[PDB]
Amino acid sequence: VSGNDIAIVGMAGRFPGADSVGEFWELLRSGREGITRFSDEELAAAGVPAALRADPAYVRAHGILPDVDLFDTGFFEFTPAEAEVIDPQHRLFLESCHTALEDAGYDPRRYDGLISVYGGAAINTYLQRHVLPSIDQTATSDHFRVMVGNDKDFLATRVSYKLDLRGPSYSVQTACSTSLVAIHLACQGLINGECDMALAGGVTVKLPQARGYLYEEGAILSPDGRVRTFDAEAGGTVLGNGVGIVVLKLLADALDAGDTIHAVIKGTATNNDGSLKVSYAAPGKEGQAAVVAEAHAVSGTEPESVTYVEAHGTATRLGDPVEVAALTDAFRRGTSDTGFCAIGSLKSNVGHLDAAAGVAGVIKTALMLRHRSLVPTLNHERPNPAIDFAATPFYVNTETRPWAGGPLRAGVSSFGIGGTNAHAILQEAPEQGPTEPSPRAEQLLVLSARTRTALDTLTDDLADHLEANPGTDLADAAHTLAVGRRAHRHRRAVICADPARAVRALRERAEPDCATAEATGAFTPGSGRALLEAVRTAWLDGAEVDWARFYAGERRRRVPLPTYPFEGRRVWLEPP
Amino acid sequence: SGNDIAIVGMAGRFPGADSVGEFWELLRSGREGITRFSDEELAAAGVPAALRADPAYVRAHGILPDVDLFDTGFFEFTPAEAEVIDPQHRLFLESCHTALEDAGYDPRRYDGLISVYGGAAINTYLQRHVLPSIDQTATSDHFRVMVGNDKDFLATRVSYKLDLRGPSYSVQTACSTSLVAIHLACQGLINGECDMALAGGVTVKLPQARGYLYEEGAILSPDGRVRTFDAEAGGTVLGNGVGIVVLKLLADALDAGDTIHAVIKGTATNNDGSLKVSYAAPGKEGQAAVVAEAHAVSGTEPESVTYVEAHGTATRLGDPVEVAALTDAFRRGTSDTGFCAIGSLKSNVGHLDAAAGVAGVIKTALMLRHRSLVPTLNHERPNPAIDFAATPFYVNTETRPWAGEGPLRAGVSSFGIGGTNAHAILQEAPEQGPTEPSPRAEQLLVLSARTRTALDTLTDDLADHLEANPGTDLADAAHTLAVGRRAHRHRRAVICADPARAVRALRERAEPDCATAEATGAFTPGPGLSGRALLEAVRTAWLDGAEVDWARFYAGERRRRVPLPTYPFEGRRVWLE
């Protein structure tokens, strides 16, 4: 019932070793590491000097993303000369915001409400390494061009401009807690009625990607390129590039709209440690415990009911104990029970994603809730002896297994250098009844893209999806493809009764089940198969169809389906 | 009521005005703070003879003096640590400190949660100074650079160095940054996430002693003037600046006896989206919507608003869009015309980028407290693309009393490249009766500093202030100096009956009225210890370094926190060459 409850109605991201939220789930539930480890030859080839590579403390590991130089300038209406000055972090952020809205099933141009954007980016390496050496900043307009392309202030607002979002749009920046803070601020804006839907998250793309790092005692990075969270041999973390976006709405609104709800954010808290700690970069035990206890209080969730925590996970021998002690302190304010809450960290799989780390935590946890599954934390052989886990609420889960009990509830932590701490409580989505039966025997599935090759990719992606998710309601899918996707020039449409037949029709591409065309004015039908055929023919010929009116009265849902397969060209200023 | 926020303190530095006090004087006087350089001065700053001889070169910039000077000892940095820090960050930290001192709050003897919200302009120090000086091969080197220079550490550094435990965020929305920060702070206060907030922003573009090439279709003026609302508006001029406001819920400020400069009745933000012709264009529709929303959330009828501090950049297209937008929003509530003055401090000091919004709020809070309008500069002929007579608005060009039937109210706008708009409604502070007389015969004024020289400067500054403001209530000033200042190692304390005798004792520096020491238990005056013996005992203990509970010492009296001179930072050069 609660006015504080926020639904996650869509998500998107790209992570080391996992180029989509769906692939991230597969990585996690398989217990796989997504960090790349380079050969010495690869690093020579990327230009790392032999002298640095030969240092026995040099570690050949980094979490990287494929294709961060490719950008679909056609799709986003940029010329290549405009786009090449823009930080790839900003480009990736834009693509992921678009993807997330598609995942949620919304076309902003048809949404009756205000959409906000809250996000942040890691430090910009593109500006120095690529932009400055190539662009003369003498004229005011060239200096402006560079600033707008590269300063963090333009990250979120570019998305608002390009996707036509008219709620508040902010870049928020708090170092490693950035994307969870963005989610906190997005939730407050929703609760306090400033927007009706929000995009929140963050991005990190540090360049060059193909590079290791020099192990240094006293700095936060691990000596072997592994992240051994909670383990006796915890020795530091490994950095990774990534991006994540969540789409958020009040729970009541999501339920009324028939959105897919992946999880509910019950509540979120933030604070700062102030000066209570040994240095600016050190963790703050009292600040951490206070943020968790405050998150419990504002969520109305008793600690006994929380049975997974996604830790911040410094994976240091000294930091992991502070994190667990702070958590233990917060939980002990509401229970004396022990051994009931699993604790884990996706950093063990993919590294520390900096600005994207908080939203990555929320995405993992929402996936866990949706699949009702715990997953392993990696590299965990012996628990850190400084943590008497058995005296605490917590145990380290190292197997994929069911998450049983609920409603299931979890905590997510994100703590920054500088001491602004965040904690969120998530709860499993509520049971909804079955979807309403369709008044038609068959459904019309519409697909469109800017190019014939993208259309073919969409067509095969949708087939793989309906194969893999055979229980998908076809009427809800059809509705989502109609109301939740912009209509482009190259068009294909299938008429069939269920997902299995759709797979075949999409793969075979023959009439009369499948029809194709490269695209007049509005078409409004004046029943049965002929109804679907007449709408199909008009739409394929480029008529504008009012899908909202076609589905009027059915209470269709929006459901996650494959999203636009961006076709980038290389958009990069080369280093000299 | 529940949405009302009090501005209880402020600090800043602006082109031609190195404090909020000097900024008032500049505005009241109708003076321009933008510096116009001679060709000599610019050769001296090292601008090429070539650029200097180009007919399109404009020799103007709003600058701040001695941004290479930082009191490393006071803020517990080594010079090595500090020189890697963006001077924008240093300045923001300094002004945050100053703002708290102005409001009368010592954050280390403070029971609640203080938050910080702010943003910084693009970092030019990093490119010109930091990167050419530091090899970043080692992780710890990369971290030193990042932590000194990324926007992420602007606010949190303050929380760490000043011990503030509310949430602390950097927020960045280009030209609207500091007004968005103010909006988020107000929301934090209303939501109960903190009980006092610092909000603002900072711009320090380098090098400072440099003009620019005028270019058609870019946003800068061809003559180095900012001719807001004028027919000759031709662009803006950039300036460096910093501003911070200290915010609390109104009811708490009234309960505490804080000095209240103005009340923020409500704030709103939005984004233009794509409802305008380009990313960089001003958005009439979004601007109108943010103003109208600010009126709705604050419960403010447009006809009750009699000044607006416009975003007011003086671009050819900007100015008519801004006025049409405001007129759109106002017309939703009233058809009246000619009742609301409009102005822009950008005409005096340029476009302060991240600090522009907070600068607007400060100007407007100053107007409200002094009950005075002030000129907008360079205004000779209204832009004929704006038929002002058909709108609520007229351009005010005179310093004069601001008066009205209902409480004075004003709007403040700030609009950013990229379309995130903000507008705030401010109202005059409520009436307060006279401050409650102390029944004590004498007050105890304390002063402390990190160095003997700073102590001597504070002592003279206080004497000066009490001489120039001889109506200052001595008990309120004693209270403020006690509860609103951290006690440092070098200490001085005067016992006196009134301000004039305080002035004498501070200047003569002689026992028994004045005593000085270098500072260790707690000292609690026993019952019955009264009058002069009480003050001598408290003085002696405090001078020796004992912890005195000042709240206890003043607990029988309703005391106020009032604006007094703040710490005289003693910078040394901190600049990576």
Please list every residue in chain A followed by a chain break, i.e. its C lies more than 2.5 Å from the next written N.
Answer: 405, 519, 526
Tell me if chain A has a CB within 8 Å of the CB of B271. Answer: yes
The total number of residues shown for chain B amounts to: 577
- The 3 state secondary structure assigned to A453-489 is HHHHHHHHHHHHHHHHCCCCCHHHHHHHHHHCCCCCC
Tell me if chain A has a CB within 8 Å of the CB of B417. Answer: yes
Resolution of the solved structure (Å): 2.0
Q: For A1-475+552-576, CATH number?
A: 3.40.47.10
**A366, A430 Cβ separation under 8 angstroms:** no
> Is A221 exposed, middle or buried, given 0-12, 13-18 or 19+ CB atoms closer than 10 A?
buried
Q: Determination method here?
A: X-ray
CB-based contact B165 A114, cutoff 8 Å: no
**B427, B262 Cβ separation under 8 angstroms:** yes
- The partner residue sitting opposite B169, judged by closest CB among A154, A168, A174, is A174
**Three-state DSSP class for residue B283:** coil
CB-based contact B156 A172, cutoff 8 Å: no
Rounded Cα distance between B456 and B501, Å, is 18
User: Among positive and negative, which fits the CA dihedral A195, A197, A198, A199?
Assistant: negative
* Angle between helices B20-28 and B356-370 in degrees, nearest 10: 70
- The partner residue sitting opposite B417, judged by closest CB among A128, A148, A417, is A148
Rounded Cα distance between B374 and B486, Å, is 36
Rounded Cα distance between A98 and A101, Å, is 5
Q: How many CA atoms lie within 13 A of B135 on its CB side?
A: 2
State the smallest CA–CA distance between residue A424 and chain B in angstroms. Answer: 15
> Is A193 exposed, middle or buried, given 0-12, 13-18 or 19+ CB atoms closer than 10 A?
exposed
Rounded Cα distance between A208 and A190, Å, is 38
Rounded Cα distance between A541 and A490, Å, is 10
Residue of chain A whose alpha carbon sits nearest to that of B117: A172
Rounded Cα distance between B455 and B475, Å, is 21
Chain A residues inside the 8 Å CB shell of B156:
174-175, 272, 416, 418-420
Tell me if chain A has a CB within 8 Å of the CB of B29. Answer: no
**B230, B314 Cβ separation under 8 angstroms:** yes
Rounded Cα distance between A116 and A101, Å, is 12
Fold classified for B476-554: 1.10.1240
**B164, B106 Cβ separation under 8 angstroms:** no
Nearest CA among A173, A47, A56, A48 for reference residue A122: A173
Q: If you count residue pairs, one on A and one on B, with CB atoms under 8 Å apart, how many are there?
A: 205
Chain B residues inside the 8 Å CB shell of A171:
171-173
Q: How many CA atoms lie within 13 A of B74 on its CB side?
A: 24
Q: For A476-551, CATH number?
A: 1.10.1240.100
Mutate to test the interface with B, among A157, A270, A294, A298 (most CBs of B within 10 A): A157
**A339, A397 Cβ separation under 8 angstroms:** no
State the smallest CA–CA distance between residue B295 and chain A in angstroms. Answer: 14
CB-based contact B272 A175, cutoff 8 Å: no
Q: Which two tokens stand for residue A52?
A: 């640095």
Residue of chain B whose alpha carbon sits nearest to that of A286: B165
CB-based contact B273 A420, cutoff 8 Å: no
Nearest CA among A262, A368, A249 for reference residue A306: A368
- The domain segmentation of chain A, as residue ranges, is 1-475+552-576, 476-551
**A202, B180 Cβ separation under 8 angstroms:** no
- The 3 state secondary structure assigned to A217-247 is CCCCECCCCCCCCCECCCECECEECEEEEEE
Nearest CA among A183, A169, A179 for reference residue A202: A179
The answer to whether the peptide bond before residue B207 is cis (omega within 30 degrees of 0) is yes
Q: Map tokens 């927020």 to a residue.
A: B171
Could you check whether B1-475+555-577 and B476-554 share the same CATH topology? no
CB-based contact A418 B159, cutoff 8 Å: yes
> Is A174 exposed, middle or buried, given 0-12, 13-18 or 19+ CB atoms closer than 10 A?
buried
- The 3 state secondary structure assigned to A53-89 is HCCCCEECEEECCCCCCEECHHHHCCCHHHHCCCCHH
Q: Which CATH number fits domain B1-475+555-577: 3.40.50.720, 1.10.420.10, 3.40.50.300, 3.40.47.10?
A: 3.40.47.10
Contacting A residues, span 44-73, partner chain B, CB-CB under 8 Å: 52
